Design an enzyme around this catalytic site. Structure first.
Site, short mmCIF file in Angstrom:
data_model
loop_
_atom_site.label_atom_id
_atom_site.label_comp_id
_atom_site.label_asym_id
_atom_site.label_seq_id
_atom_site.Cartn_x
_atom_site.Cartn_y
_atom_site.Cartn_z
N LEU A 56 0.82 -1.20 0.00
CA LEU A 56 0.00 0.00 0.00
C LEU A 56 0.86 1.26 0.00
O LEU A 56 1.90 1.30 0.66
CB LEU A 56 -0.92 0.01 1.22
CG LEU A 56 -1.80 -1.22 1.42
CD1 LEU A 56 -2.53 -1.14 2.74
CD2 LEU A 56 -2.78 -1.34 0.27
N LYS A 66 6.72 -2.63 12.23
CA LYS A 66 5.86 -2.41 13.39
C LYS A 66 4.60 -3.27 13.32
O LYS A 66 4.11 -3.75 14.34
CB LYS A 66 5.50 -0.93 13.53
CG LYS A 66 6.66 -0.03 13.95
CD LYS A 66 6.20 1.40 14.15
CE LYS A 66 7.30 2.27 14.75
NZ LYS A 66 8.51 2.29 13.88
N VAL A 97 -6.55 20.35 24.41
CA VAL A 97 -7.15 21.65 24.67
C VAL A 97 -6.89 22.55 23.47
O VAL A 97 -5.74 22.70 23.05
CB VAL A 97 -6.55 22.32 25.92
CG1 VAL A 97 -7.26 23.64 26.21
CG2 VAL A 97 -6.63 21.39 27.12
N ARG A 177 -21.30 18.37 2.14
CA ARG A 177 -21.26 17.11 1.40
C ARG A 177 -22.26 16.10 1.96
O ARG A 177 -22.29 14.95 1.55
CB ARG A 177 -19.85 16.52 1.40
CG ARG A 177 -18.79 17.43 0.80
CD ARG A 177 -17.54 16.66 0.41
NE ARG A 177 -17.15 15.69 1.43
CZ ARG A 177 -16.29 15.95 2.41
NH1 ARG A 177 -15.74 17.15 2.51
NH2 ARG A 177 -15.99 15.01 3.30
N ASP A 184 -17.29 20.84 13.53
CA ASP A 184 -17.51 22.26 13.77
C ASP A 184 -18.33 22.87 12.64
O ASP A 184 -18.77 22.16 11.74
CB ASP A 184 -16.17 22.99 13.88
CG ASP A 184 -15.30 22.79 12.66
OD1 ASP A 184 -15.67 21.99 11.78
OD2 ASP A 184 -14.23 23.44 12.59
N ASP A 186 -18.11 25.67 9.63
CA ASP A 186 -17.24 26.51 8.82
C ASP A 186 -18.07 27.32 7.84
O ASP A 186 -18.62 26.78 6.88
CB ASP A 186 -16.21 25.65 8.08
CG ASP A 186 -15.13 26.48 7.41
OD1 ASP A 186 -15.05 27.69 7.68
OD2 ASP A 186 -14.35 25.90 6.62
N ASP A 248 -16.33 28.80 12.68
CA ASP A 248 -15.47 29.73 11.98
C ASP A 248 -16.27 30.49 10.93
O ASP A 248 -17.17 29.93 10.31
CB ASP A 248 -14.29 29.01 11.32
CG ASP A 248 -13.36 28.38 12.33
OD1 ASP A 248 -13.40 28.78 13.51
OD2 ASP A 248 -12.57 27.48 11.94
NA NA Z 1 -4.52 21.93 21.02
NA NA Z 2 5.20 1.18 0.13
#
Ligand code: NA
Ligand code: NA
Length: 327
Positions: A56, A66, A97, A177, A184, A186, A248
């Site tokens: 991928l 990992k 925060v 959409r 939030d 916008d 916003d």
């Molecule tokens: Na922050």
């Molecule tokens: Na790759």
DNA sequence: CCGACGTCGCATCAGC
DNA sequence: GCTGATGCGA
DNA sequence: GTCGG
């Protein structure tokens, strides 16, 4: 693709990302992990090996390794360790925060300030933004049901039009959409009197009205073109009060409005494709303008845009409803 | 190997 | 005081 | 951390 396919992997990668952003302060590593998490989250097979994942795009050698360790042991030694690091887990948390970034979080933890409780004990060390972020910590981490977004939109469009019937306002983001929830609100705003080749009051008037009717409750930042603040739907008598929400509002010149609407409607992946396709047709698209690319890459003047469709036409693409713009 | 990985408004800080 | 840098958010 | 010039 369900969250039990490779959810352990995508959680692992998302966790690693946050530590890169918030603790190591390596934003590009944060996005690398983020991208790897996304490409795996869309992968419709239970991954059997790191080598499989490596195929991928966005998954390199180290994430493959990992994944191997995770599949074989059910955990990541480095992640396990950093989880129980009291300093790192504290820095990582405080960044939740709004207003507290990696640097502020690092400073707080340096001087013993690790928890929300600690923050409350130390109001004088917080700027205005951070205090609001603290005050509404829980509310801000809640999502906004589309029905509430609709109610919020009702108030925004009504009050804006009541200030000046010529204002144009568009609620964008994933909401436009057709998302069933939002993080939030916008709002993109324009007026026929405001162009690029151009009052320094058009945004203030709208913010003031939404304050007057007690929709907007707090201000994180406010200038002539960009407002960032807090809002709340009115309480319906006995009913439990609504969570405070982030909103916003930005004022965009009329000639850059629809390039603005397009960009802030997204999605991110769709925007990438549309810009990719635009180059092929010899146009550079950004947040503000669409411009033609001369034979050596020299961009000419911005082409006039009077609607979203106008942009699609320029680049010989068919207009796609926001509903169909997830990619 | 080694640079790119979006961009910019606003609040605030660092320097002069 | 002013100008430019930095932090932050999106 | 990953990709790619
Ligand atoms: Na922050
Ligand atoms: Na790759």
């Amino acid at each position: 693709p369900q969250e039990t396919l490779n959810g352990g992997i995508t959680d692992m990668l998302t966790e690693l990302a946050n530590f890169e952003k918030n603790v190591s302060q390596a934003i590009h590593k944060y996005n690398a992990y983020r991208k790897a998490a996304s490409v795996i989250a869309k992968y419709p097979h239970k991954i059997k090996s790191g080598a499989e994942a490596k195929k991928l795009p966005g998954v390199g050698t180290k994430i493959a390794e990992k994944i191997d360790e995770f599949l074989a042991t059910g955990k990541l030694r480095k992640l396990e360790k950093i989880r129980q690091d009291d300093t790192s887990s504290s820095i990582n948390f405080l960044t939740r925060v709004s207003g507290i970034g990696p640097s502020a979080a690092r400073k707080f933890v340096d001087e013993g300030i690790k928890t929300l409780e600690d923050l409350r004990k130390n109001e004088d060390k917080l700027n205005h933004h951070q205090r609001i972020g603290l005050k509404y910590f829980g509310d801000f981490e809640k999502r906004i049901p589309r029905e509430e977004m609709l109610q919020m939109q009702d108030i925004v469009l009504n009050e804006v039009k009541k200030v000046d019937s010529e204002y144009i306002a568009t609620v964008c983001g994933s909401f436009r959409r057709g998302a069933e929830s939002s993080g939030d609100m916008d709002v993109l705003l324009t007026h026929p009197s405001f162009t690029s080749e151009s009052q320094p009051k058009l945004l203030h008037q709208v913010v003031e009205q939404l304050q007057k009717v007690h929709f907007i409750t707090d201000t994180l930042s406010k200038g002539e073109t960009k407002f960032m603040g807090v809002c709340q739907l009115p309480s319906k008598n006995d009913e439990k009060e609504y969570p405070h929400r982030r909103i916003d509002i930005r004022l965009i010149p009329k000639d850059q409005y629809y390039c603005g609407v397009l960009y802030f409607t997204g999605s991110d992946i769709f925007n990438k494709n549309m810009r990719a396709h635009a180059l092929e047709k010899g146009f550079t698209i950004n947040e503000y303008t669409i411009r033609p690319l001369g034979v050596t890459g020299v961009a000419g003047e911005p082409l006039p845009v009077d609607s979203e469709k106008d942009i699609f036409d320029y680049i010989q693409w068919k207009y796609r409803e926001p509903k169909d713009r997830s990619e």
